[PDB]
Amino acid sequence: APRFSVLSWPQVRRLDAILCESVPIHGRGNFPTLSCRPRDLVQVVRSRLEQKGILVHNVRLNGSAASYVLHHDSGLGYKDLDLIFMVDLKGPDAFQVVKHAVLNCLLDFLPSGVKITPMTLKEAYVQKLVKVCTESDRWSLISLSNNSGKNMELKFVDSLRRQFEFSVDSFQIILDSMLMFSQNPMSQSFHPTVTGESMYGDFEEAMDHLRNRIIATRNPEEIRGGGLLKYCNLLVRGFRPKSEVDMKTMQRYMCSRYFIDFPDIREQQRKLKCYLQDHFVGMEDKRYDYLMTLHQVVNESTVCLMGHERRQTLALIASLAVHVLSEQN
């Protein structure tokens, strides 16, 4: 039952592809659209962080991209490129140093021209900035936009208890052995050894859920409100719970946490509109199936004490589904 595993050659081949594929970084306003390889961005960000005194232990690839590396036939696809930097943030002003380091990296990928302020680069390329500082969790996130609903999230984690929602998207692939390989063609008889970790706690059990398209988790009480939204995305993509008891348990927690995190129905509409716009760029027609899936889960798993909330949310979902249908003919 180990939570670690060494990647095979087809997995290493796909990991090298992702690290070498050029990705665009959209600039708001007059800023040019950048083009960088993920291996280069990791290298330049890690180097400058270490120059400013922030220790970088290792860098990982998370999200559905890691699942695609481990299993190309994953029903998940991959929209986000999630890069996790294992850094030491207990130092003074570490969050601001990380921010300015990444902003300085965007300055390097700019073409020949111009001494551009960090605040102007932030408004140009940073789509989201998150900072969490507590005795238990300490990390930061800087999100860049790939101008197609895709996001490049640079997460800098010092301490984070839970880094997974479900088993099928819980993989982090350490990249350090890949970056030192060049800094020649890669082959089956000559390729670096790569170690992967399953935040779900069992690499082979999670790989089984990925091959068989199973929805499973551990400690569902810790799942955030957004877990319900990802859950319905898994259902539309063909992933199904492992048993009926497992389904009712998971859905009850995700519905309960959904109302806790988003009590205001106005907050629900704004987040639901954002989720539909971001996760269906290549499949706008599937938005109806998603809302019907979400409508069913909310209707069947909302404790009978929250009847007003259940009826409130179902009306919002149905209203969004009508709007989607109204786009045709």
C-alpha atoms as one frame of an Amber mdcrd trajectory, in Angstrom:
protein
   0.000   0.000   0.000   2.829   2.560  -0.499   1.950   6.125  -1.466   5.009
   6.467  -3.741   5.952   4.900  -7.062   8.572   5.304  -9.773   7.182   6.258
 -13.165   7.382   3.949 -16.160   8.853   4.959 -19.510   5.534   5.888 -21.227
   4.741   8.028 -18.182   8.192   9.647 -18.283   7.757  10.189 -22.030   4.466
  12.018 -21.469   5.899  13.995 -18.542   8.775  15.191 -20.732   6.259  16.220
 -23.389   4.298  18.418 -20.966   7.494  20.025 -19.657   8.645  20.846 -23.213
   5.310  22.004 -24.700   5.205  25.766 -25.142   2.352  27.433 -23.256   0.994
  30.981 -23.702   0.762  33.459 -20.838  -1.867  36.066 -21.702  -1.144  39.703
 -20.885  -3.919  42.108 -19.946  -3.842  45.409 -21.800  -0.837  46.248 -23.959
   1.304  43.427 -22.556   2.494  40.826 -25.098   1.366  37.215 -24.838   4.319
  35.275 -23.422   5.419  31.816 -24.567   7.471  29.630 -22.224   8.186  25.983
 -21.596   7.148  24.686 -18.145  10.645  23.304 -17.508  12.041  26.769 -18.230
   9.517  28.546 -15.999  10.210  26.120 -13.146  13.959  26.572 -13.640  13.854
  30.378 -13.730  11.428  30.595 -10.796  13.394  28.109  -8.682  16.732  29.790
  -9.431  15.532  33.274  -8.482  13.802  31.981  -5.338  17.043  30.328  -4.213
  18.951  33.522  -5.050  16.682  35.457  -2.664  17.379  32.993   0.159  14.198
  30.896  -0.073  14.983  27.180   0.013  13.320  25.117  -2.727  13.338  21.449
  -1.733  11.626  20.072  -4.856   9.015  20.882  -7.505   6.010  18.732  -8.415
   3.343  18.522 -11.111  -0.197  18.174  -9.734  -3.699  18.550 -11.169  -5.181
  16.361 -13.849  -1.963  16.841 -15.843  -0.172  14.441 -13.489  -2.974  11.917
 -14.002  -2.544  12.233 -17.773   1.191  11.604 -17.363   0.451   8.449 -15.364
  -2.451   7.355 -17.602  -2.963   9.005 -20.998  -6.462   7.499 -21.316  -7.706
   9.445 -18.274 -11.285  10.693 -18.636 -10.141  13.778 -16.756  -8.222  15.513
 -19.499  -6.068  18.374 -18.305  -6.922  22.080 -18.463  -4.702  23.415 -15.668
  -0.927  23.130 -15.369  -0.427  22.874 -11.606   3.174  23.377 -10.463   3.856
  22.963  -6.736   7.090  24.384  -5.299   8.170  22.843  -1.980   9.622  25.966
  -0.375  10.443  27.209   3.118   8.223  30.217   3.854   8.812  30.695   7.589
  11.410  33.349   6.746  10.708  37.072   6.990   8.577  38.568   4.206   8.746
  35.221   2.395   5.374  35.707   0.686   6.388  39.054  -0.824   9.752  37.635
  -1.915   8.033  34.733  -3.697   5.599  37.141  -5.367   8.342  39.491  -6.569
  10.448  36.519  -7.694   7.689  35.223  -9.980   6.973  38.744 -11.238  10.677
  39.119 -12.019  10.501  35.846 -13.961   7.685  37.198 -16.139   9.975  40.176
 -16.759  12.612  37.797 -18.152  10.231  36.157 -20.643   9.329  39.588 -22.066
  10.734  40.401 -25.533  13.378  43.063 -26.190  11.930  46.288 -24.813  12.193
  48.584 -21.793  12.352  48.489 -15.859   8.647  47.591 -15.637   7.145  47.812
 -12.169   6.097  44.605 -10.367   2.569  45.921  -9.815   2.139  46.472 -13.562
   3.298  42.917 -14.317   0.897  41.541 -11.696  -2.140  43.209 -13.274  -0.980
  42.008 -16.712  -0.354  38.283 -16.192  -1.574  37.313 -12.704  -5.167  36.068
 -12.812  -5.335  35.149  -9.123  -3.166  35.579  -6.034  -3.832  33.589  -2.857
  -1.981  33.692   0.462  -2.668  31.455   3.478  -0.711  31.850   6.730  -1.568
  29.902   9.900   0.049  27.579  12.442  -1.080  24.550  10.388  -1.138  25.611
   6.712   1.322  28.044   5.128   1.374  28.437   1.350   0.796  30.872  -1.501
  -0.527  30.623  -5.044   0.070  32.753  -8.142  -2.194  31.874 -11.072  -1.401
  32.733 -14.694  -3.865  32.601 -17.586  -3.323  30.526 -20.731  -6.056  32.645
 -22.443  -8.273  29.631 -23.213  -9.901  28.966 -19.853  -6.655  27.171 -19.007
  -4.762  28.258 -15.902  -1.117  27.907 -14.884  -1.106  27.812 -11.087   2.241
  28.274  -9.328   1.659  27.026  -5.784   4.352  27.550  -3.138   3.627  25.246
  -0.200   5.485  25.348   3.107   2.821  23.417   5.030  -0.491  22.040   3.752
  -2.326  19.178   5.439  -4.539  18.036   2.545  -3.605  18.464  -1.128  -6.257
  16.264  -2.741 -10.008  15.903  -3.146 -10.435  12.561  -4.944  -8.043   9.708
  -5.670  -7.999  10.212  -9.453  -6.513  13.741  -9.320  -4.314  13.293  -6.230
  -0.959  12.687  -7.963   2.133  14.881  -7.616   5.110  14.030  -9.834   8.476
  15.295  -8.591  10.259  17.031 -11.472  13.777  17.483 -10.047  15.229  14.433
 -11.813  13.812  15.647 -15.145  15.260  19.170 -15.007  18.829  18.044 -14.266
  18.731  15.590 -17.194  19.453  18.287 -19.784  20.737  21.037 -17.479  19.774
  15.352 -26.007  16.862  13.084 -26.912  15.203  10.909 -24.293  14.758   7.195
 -24.981  13.403   4.053 -23.348  16.886   2.652 -22.678  18.122   6.077 -21.493
  15.769   8.229 -19.400  15.834   9.604 -15.839  14.096   7.931 -12.920  11.084
   9.880 -11.642   9.233   9.419  -8.348   5.514  10.128  -8.015   3.411  10.533
  -4.880  -0.297   9.919  -4.309  -1.767  12.380  -1.810  -4.650   9.900  -1.523
  -2.203   7.621   0.320  -2.012   4.594  -1.998  -0.428   4.943  -5.433  -1.644
   1.643  -6.882  -5.165   1.948  -5.458  -5.476   5.444  -6.932  -4.108   4.189
 -10.261  -6.863   1.562 -10.179  -9.496   4.268  -9.692  -7.941   6.151 -12.614
  -8.020   3.159 -14.975 -11.520   2.061 -13.919 -12.917   5.615 -13.509 -13.903
   5.394  -9.848 -14.843   8.298  -7.573 -13.281   7.748  -4.152 -11.787   9.827
  -1.359 -10.481   9.687   2.212 -11.753  11.781   5.130 -14.716  13.312   3.243
 -15.376  15.645   6.193 -12.295  17.674   5.170 -13.576  18.280   1.613 -14.253
  21.956   0.824 -17.446  23.393  -0.646 -16.019  23.224  -4.164 -15.663  19.448
  -3.897 -19.302  19.086  -4.938 -18.553  20.924  -8.189 -15.603  18.655  -9.017
 -17.670  15.592  -8.074 -20.359  16.345 -10.659 -17.614  17.001 -13.216 -16.326
  13.477 -12.556 -19.819  12.021 -13.021 -20.275  13.710 -16.405 -16.867  12.363
 -17.495 -17.877   8.763 -16.738 -16.398   8.424 -13.246 -18.735   6.696 -10.801
 -18.603   5.935  -7.066 -17.328   2.528  -6.038 -20.598   1.543  -4.310 -24.039
   2.905  -3.487 -23.152   3.455   0.178 -19.966   5.248  -0.889 -22.021   7.486
  -3.196 -24.575   8.601  -0.602 -21.875   9.270   2.006 -19.674  11.415  -0.258
 -22.588  13.398  -1.684 -24.034  14.157   1.754 -20.716  15.663   2.897 -20.167
  17.678  -0.286 -23.707  19.061  -0.238 -23.383  19.949   3.456 -20.026  21.663
   2.923 -21.340  23.419  -0.205 -23.987  25.272   1.813 -21.522  26.034   4.628
 -18.941  27.652   2.344 -21.512  29.354   0.067 -24.624  30.202   2.104 -25.619
  33.199  -0.019 -27.479  32.098  -3.145 -25.972  35.146  -4.866 -22.540  33.722
  -4.046 -23.624  30.358  -5.466 -24.766  31.918  -8.755 -21.499  33.816  -9.200
 -19.347  30.743  -8.514 -21.575  28.472 -10.615 -21.442  30.874 -13.568 -17.646
  30.952 -13.254 -17.375  27.152 -13.113 -19.519  26.714 -16.233 -17.453  29.272
 -18.153 -14.075  27.829 -17.120 -14.602  24.055 -17.375 -16.572  23.732 -20.638
 -14.510  25.630 -23.215 -14.415  22.608 -25.515 -17.804  21.217 -24.473 -20.387
  23.969 -23.936 -23.166  21.498 -24.761 -22.173  19.325 -21.783 -23.104  22.234
 -19.485 -26.713  21.011 -19.453 -25.691  17.494 -18.401 -23.515  18.983 -15.654
 -26.297  21.146 -14.215 -28.723  18.213 -14.323 -26.103  16.126 -12.511 -25.584
  18.867  -9.922 -29.356  19.305  -9.564 -29.819  15.589  -8.852 -27.022  15.397
  -6.266 -28.237  18.465  -4.359 -31.831  17.208  -4.442 -30.969  13.703  -3.184
 -28.258  14.416  -0.581 -29.324  17.638   1.188 -30.263  16.824   4.790 -33.963
  17.472   5.405 -33.101  20.240   7.885 -31.884  22.509   5.052 -35.059  22.361
   2.970 -35.035  26.077   2.186 -31.408  25.895   1.030 -32.101  22.813  -1.098
 -35.102  24.447  -2.768 -33.172  27.720  -3.138 -30.206  26.074  -4.880 -32.279
  23.778  -7.114 -34.053  26.836  -8.530 -30.705  28.486  -9.301 -29.441  25.340
 -11.044 -32.636  24.957 -13.079 -32.452  28.633 -14.061 -28.892  28.141 -15.317
 -29.906  25.035 -17.283 -32.737  26.927 -18.995 -30.313  29.690 -19.976 -27.989
  27.086 -21.521 -30.865  25.520 -23.469 -32.036  28.962 -24.619 -28.770  29.425
 -26.557 -29.866  27.005 -29.294 -32.321  27.759 -32.094
